[PDB]
């Protein structure tokens, strides 16, 4: 529809995928507001069309069109008014930040500990399925109540919910292009009930600290839980992203270091920098590179575009985070980039909840493993490459090391 933009309509969802980079330097200087044909949806690209319309009193929640198939209702990202405030109110107290620096040590390092034992003698190792995931879905696995989902099936999970909530394509008539690529998902969640249900029965009885006992129990009547329909697209958007998105963090901050080899010498000299460098790296390659939007509630005018009331903006955070009007050189990883605001934990009423917890997690399982190797060497005969336009980061961190 826009002429001078007819270059998007070949824009592939793999070429997205493999990396969505040049086509969205491309958008921040042409149309910082822009629909994207195979997305079937506009895209903000920039940090200042990202911040205003995840802040602007005009938007509201939704659920992108593939996160929707996956979620259903009431997904906590997808829903505003009278049910996101009980769902915010439902996850927030195990996330607030003087209840996570009482366990967070005692959680995340043995932990940490755990997984490093059995390779950090090697000599080799592939850091994405031997350390960072693992440490962040057992942290949170744990904290949950899933003691007893082993980490290989929640790395499984959040694989399969990622391919399932980021199954964007669309074909010439706004139709799904692949909707074979929801059956996954469906199978995922499918497993998750047979899990979770005998868990939920449980705790309904007989609450426990668990973060799900506490999201059955928490604010109601006496006698009384949420209902577990009510509850279980929010355990699924957990088991995706809260899942995934810190050992990404910790793996995309690695190859960013490796890619610096002077910085990297200093982080691990200097174990306080490490919260710097999480930070870098987040900006660098942001995990949740566009998963969530917002949709319109009356006629609005944004970036030049007059969009009526109901329009869907997906939130390109990833690319906001490369906006060369606010750094210098996105590209690069410089952990000495000054310290300046970042979109990758969103913003607005619908921010990220966790991101306390989060930075804590990266930060003590980049501490444990920088202690436990600190002569960590990226294994330069293999590349590093990262995937995902939804959700984004490196598929293998292969290193090596001195024994
Ligand atoms: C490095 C790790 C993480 C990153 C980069 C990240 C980033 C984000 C982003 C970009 C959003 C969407 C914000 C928006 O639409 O404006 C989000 C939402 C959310 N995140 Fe995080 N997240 C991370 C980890 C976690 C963890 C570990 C948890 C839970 C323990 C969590 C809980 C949530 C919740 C509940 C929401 C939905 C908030 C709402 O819609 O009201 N996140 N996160
Ligand atoms: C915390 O988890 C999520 C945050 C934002 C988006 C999604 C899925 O679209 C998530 O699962």
Not at 233 to 245: C, F, N, R
Not at 246 to 252: L, N, Y
Request: hydrophobic content about 40%.
């Amino acid at each position: 529809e826009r002429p001078d933009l007819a270059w998007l309509d070949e824009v592939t969802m793999t070429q997205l995928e493999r990396n969505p980079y040049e086509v969205y330097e491309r958008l921040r200087a042409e149309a910082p507001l822009a629909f994207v044909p195979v997305l079937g949806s506009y895209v903000a690209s920039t940090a200042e069309v990202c911040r205003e319309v995840a802040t602007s009193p005009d938007f509201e929640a939704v659920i992108t069109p593939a996160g929707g198939r996956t979620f259903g209702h009431p997904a906590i990202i997808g829903v505003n008014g009278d049910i996101h405030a009980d769902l915010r109110s439902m996850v927030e107290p195990a996330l607030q930040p003087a209840e996570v620096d009482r366990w967070i040590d005692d959680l995340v390092r043995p932990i940490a500990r755990r997984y490093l034992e059995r390779f950090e003698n090697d000599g080799h190792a592939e850091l994405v399925a031997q350390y960072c995931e693992p440490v962040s879905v057992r942290s949170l696995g744990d904290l949950l109540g899933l003691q007893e989902v082993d980490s290989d099936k929640l790395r499984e999970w959040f694989a399969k919910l990622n391919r399932s909530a980021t199954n964007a394509a669309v074909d010439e008539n706004g139709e799904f292009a692949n909707p074979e690529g929801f059956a996954e998902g469906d199978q995922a969640k499918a497993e998750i009930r047979a899990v979770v249900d005998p868990l939920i029965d449980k705790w309904i009885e007989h609450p426990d600290d668990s973060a799900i006992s506490h999201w059955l129990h928490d604010g109601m009547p006496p006698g009384q839980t949420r209902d577990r329909e009510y509850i279980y697209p929010t355990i699924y958007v957990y088991l995706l992203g809260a899942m995934q998105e810190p050992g990404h963090g910790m793996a995309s901050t690695l190859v960013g270091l490796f890619s610096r080899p002077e910085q990297l010498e200093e982080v691990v000299d200097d174990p306080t920098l490490i919260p710097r460098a999480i930070a870098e790296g987040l900006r660098w390659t942001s995990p949740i590179w566009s998963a969530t939007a917002r949709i319109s509630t009356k006629p609005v005018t944004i970036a030049g575009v007059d969009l009526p009331a109901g329009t869907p903006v997906m939130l390109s955070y990833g690319s906001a985070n490369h906006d060369t009007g606010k750094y210098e050189a996105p590209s690069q990883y410089d952990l000495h980039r000054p310290p300046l605001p970042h979109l990758a934990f969103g913003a607005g009423n619908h921010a990220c909840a966790g991101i306390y917890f989060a930075n804590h997690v990266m930060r003590i399982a980049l501490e444990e493993l920088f202690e436990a190797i600190p002569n960590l060497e990226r294994d330069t005969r293999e590349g590093v490459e990262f995937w995902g336009w939804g959700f984004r980061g490196p598929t293998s961190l292969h290193v090596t090391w001195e024994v």
